[PDB]
Design a protein around this ligand. Structure first.
Ligand code: K57
Lengths: 99, 99
């Protein structure tokens, strides 16, 4: 599809059997989701942006459904103010910036 | 043009006659740039990022060029990990997300 940027590009995603609203974010290297339960092992990580850093849990090979597109990748879980779909997953659904 | 997201969407911008590197950021509502000198009066502005809210200086109607595309709008100046070109300017250059 073609999403204009007049407003926040929010989309519904399916992850860990749950449905959530997430921001299609080209500025994010990683995909960060609010506290939730995920299968598999994990390791600590610190990520930083505007406002500083937060500690999150890195889970790998996590499947996510985005607007009908199934993508697999690393997902960081932690106290993020907003759920963001990063480049590691945007590439998998073939998302690009155009102008 | 069409920009893929395998690597950070870093582009060259021009503000105040100087060239700088910035990130095309669909997850940012505003354009935030590192400390620099801009003309005119500024207003206070609080923006919320991954690590919390921070105070920045808001300058309006600032002339800025993004990858050759001219734009004139609000630019926020403050402590940021990258100079980020947010939605307020991405829309001015007709940038959209596609997949
Ligand atoms: C700058 C800004 C505004 O002026 C207004 C609203 C949100 C943001 C903002 O920081 N947006 C963020 C995403 C976000 C929104 C709400 C809560 C948390 C995060 C972003 O587009 C991004 O990926 N950024 C901005 S700074 C960055 C380039 C390092 C990168 C980043 O934080 N990346 C990680 C999430 C991977 C840390």
């Amino acid at each position: 599809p073609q999403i204009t940027l007049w407003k926040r590009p929010l989309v519904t995603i399916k992850i860990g059997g749950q449905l959530k609203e997430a921001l299609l974010d080209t500025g994010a290297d990683d995909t960060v989701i609010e506290e939730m339960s995920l299968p598999g092992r994990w390791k600590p990580k610190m990520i930083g942006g505007i406002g500083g850093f937060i500690k999150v849990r890195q889970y790998d090979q996590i499947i996510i459904e985005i607007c009908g597109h199934k993508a697999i990748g690393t997902v960081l879980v932690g106290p993020t103010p907003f759920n963001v779909i990063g480049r590691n997953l945007l590439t998998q659904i073939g998302c690009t910036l155009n102008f």
